[PDB]
């Protein structure tokens, strides 16, 4: 079936717990596979040790820039960027997992977890999974954001990987 992956997240060096994500490989196999492999680190790079660098309360928590840690970087397992696979899944509510980008066909490694329905992103960002467990952890992360996106605690993915 579809992969289950995990992110273990610290805030200011103390653990918040685990976010478990289902990746919809049946709908977006290429996008799911990229995220899966970046969680395991099996290509020699990935999310371990990187941060949630942009967090906006009542919107979303963004992460995945494991090269520049600020929203300018990241890379996929395929190359620096890869196309928008499809827009079939929608930003339906809290817990949606979707690709951040810098315009059409600029997916790399950055991603976000929504904390509300974000319908205006439908057709612009590729949705590829959702939170199975750990929305409490997501709400903690969200609470350390701000309107500007600047975080008030350092939010680190200490460990990540594949459960099934």
Describe the protein:
There is one protein chain. The protein contains 2 helices and 8 strands; from the N terminus they run ββαβββββαβ. With 164 residues, it is an alpha+beta fold. It has one domain: Cyclophilin. Strands 3-4-6-5-7-2-1-8 form an 8-stranded antiparallel beta sheet. β1 and β2 (14-23) form a beta hairpin. It is globular. The N and C termini lie close together (8 Å). GO terms for molecular function: cyclosporin A binding; peptidyl-prolyl cis-trans isomerase activity. Its EC number is 5.2.1.8. It is an enzyme of class 5 (isomerase). The modification N6-succinyllysine is found at residues 24, 43, 132, 147. This is Peptidyl-prolyl cis-trans isomerase F, mitochondrial.
């Amino acid at each position: 079936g579809n992969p289950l992956v995990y992110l273990d997240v610290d805030a200011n060096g103390k653990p918040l717990g685990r976010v478990v994500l289902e990746l919809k490989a049946d709908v977006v196999p290429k996008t799911a596979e990229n995220f899966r492999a970046l969680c395991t680190g099996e290509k020699g790079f990935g999310y371990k040790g990187s941060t949630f660098h942009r967090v906006i309360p009542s919107f979303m928590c963004q992460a995945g820039d494991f090269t520049n840690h600020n929203g300018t970087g990241g890379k996929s397992i395929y190359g620096s960027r890869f196309p928008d696979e499809n827009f079939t899944l929608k930003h339906v509510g809290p817990g949606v997992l979707s690709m951040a980008n810098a315009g059409p066909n600029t997916n790399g490694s950055q991603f976000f977890i929504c904390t509300i329905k974000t319908d205006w992103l439908d057709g612009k960002h590729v949705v590829f999974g959702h939170v199975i467990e750990g929305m409490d952890v997501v709400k903690k992360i969200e609470s350390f954001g701000s309107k500007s996106g600047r975080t008030s605690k350092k939010i680190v993915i200490t460990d990540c990987g594949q459960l099934s």
